[PDB]
Amino acid sequence: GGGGGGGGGG
Amino acid sequence: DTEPGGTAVEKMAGDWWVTVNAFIDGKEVEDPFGAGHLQMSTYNTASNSETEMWLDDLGNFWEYKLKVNVNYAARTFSTTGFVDNVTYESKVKITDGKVLEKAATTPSGMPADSIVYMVQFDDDEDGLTYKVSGFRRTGFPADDF
């Protein structure tokens, strides 16, 4: 029903 | 080429590493309170004027934070009389304050921006005028204290 992004490092 | 932008008073805002002297008996006294280098901040106002900026000691000296007036073209800032402190209900008076481009030098030996301003506190029972002066924080930890 959608889809996940991920954040990055920092 | 895209101009990044900036708050109306951008060139005088920033984080700073400052030291606080005092004029006692006409001769300047290098760091009386035994303070070491302290951190402080200057930043634009919510009204985004090019005529007033905030001045914030971040609680590392007297615990003060007031709007100064601002002469952007000249790179100077100053109060007219004693003004409401916002941190803890007091009054502060900033005088002969300036922001001098790349005039200073860092601990690592690189140029940076000197800041200098004279200040007084309505509940300084000694009635003293202090001399705050530092430079703009680099971010390199070697240029920290």
Binding site: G9, G10 | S108, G139, F140, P141
Partner: protein, 49 residues
């Protein structure tokens, strides 16, 4: 500005939130065989082009 986070300097960042460019020699990247690459902290505009 160059490599860093929170505005501070950093040898390993995947991003450019660091101090203003000094031109001053700084470290970057990992340590291999007890050595490390050391280079002028200068911008390189073409580095993707």
């Amino acid at each position: 500005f160059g490599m860093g986070w929170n505005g501070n300097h950093t040898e390993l960042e995947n991003g450019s939130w660091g101090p203003r460019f000094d031109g001053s020699m700084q470290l970057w990247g990992n340590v291999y065989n007890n050595s490390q690459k050391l280079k002028p902290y200068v911008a390189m505009p073409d580095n993707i082009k």
